Amino acid sequence: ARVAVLISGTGSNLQALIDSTREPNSSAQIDIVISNKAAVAGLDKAERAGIPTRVINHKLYKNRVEFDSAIDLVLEEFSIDIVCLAGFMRILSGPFVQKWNGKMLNIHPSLLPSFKGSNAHEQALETGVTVTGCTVHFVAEDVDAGQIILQEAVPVKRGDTVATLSERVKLAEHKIFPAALQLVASGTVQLGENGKICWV
Numbered sequence: 001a002r003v004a005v006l007i008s009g010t011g012s013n014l015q016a017l018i019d020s021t022r023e024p025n026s027s028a029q030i031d032i033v034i035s036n037k038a039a040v041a042g043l044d045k046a047e048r049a050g051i052p053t054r055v056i057n058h059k060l061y062k063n064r065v066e067f068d069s070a071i072d073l074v075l076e077e078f079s080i081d082i083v084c085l086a087g088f089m090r091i092l093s094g095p096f097v098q099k100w101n102g103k104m105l106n107i108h109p110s111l112l113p114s115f116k117g118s119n120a121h122e123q124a125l126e127t128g129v130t131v132t133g134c135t136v137h138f139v140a141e142d143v144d145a146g147q148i149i150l151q152e153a154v155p156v157k158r159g160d161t162v163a164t165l166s167e168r169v170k171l172a173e174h175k176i177f178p179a180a181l182q183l184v185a186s187g188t189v190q191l192g193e194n195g196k197i198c199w200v
């Protein structure tokens, strides 16, 4: 399966995906890295890995649909089969999400359905949970319907901050995101016709 990774920042998840997809048994190949922010470290990791990069600036488009539509053109150009959102901090429009339904994965730093949204770690610390984690899920129009592929629990330790908690969670992200990509790319996991996860 041909995979595009969309990023917005450091790209530690991108690096984990690169490392895994280069393994001989990987059913996925990363053929393009797309960032909405220039000069982000994720672009360097891609270039070090010899992966084509494309910066698409959301701030240069008349609206989201024209911005998403720009991304979709790159995806078609590279004949992409699966889209991995790895730190992509730009909400995608309904028609784009509709087109790539069942083919777009996202990593979220919480045990969904808990702590949806942009500051999951802050929410988890404010709430006082002692167990958090991360989630790889199919991207749906409303984040409340995205089917879950893999999760991993991560302990919240006394005195944790966003810095220390996010660091611990990212170690789990770097495990379940490559595993989830491998599950989808191999056809072992798919969005069944009923809309729920289907294990083949």
Ligand SMILES: Nc1nc2ccn(CCCCc3ccc(C(=O)N[C@@H](CCC(=O)O)C(=O)O)c(F)c3)c2c(=O)[nH]1
Pocket: 085, 088, 089, 090, 091, 092, 093, 094, 097, 106, 117, 118, 139, 140, 141, 142, 143, 146
């Ligand atoms: N339809 C759908 N689309 C997308 C795109 C990524 N994802 C994966 C979920 C990612 C969690 C997330 C990410 C970003 C924001 C956010 O606030 N974005 C601002 C700009 C942010 C900035 O300035 O850094 C904006 O784009 O307006 C947020 F609220 C929650 C999804 C998804 O799950 N569904």
Ligand SMILES: NCC(=O)N[C@@H]1O[C@H](COP(=O)([O-])[O-])[C@@H](O)[C@H]1O
Pocket: 007, 008, 009, 010, 011, 012, 013, 014, 042, 086, 087, 088, 106, 107, 108, 109, 117, 118, 119, 120, 170, 173
């Ligand atoms: N779902 C939105 C969200 O909170 N995304 C989070 O951004 C980070 C990017 O890390 P990276 O750029 O080092 O991979 C990840 O920890 C990911 O869970």
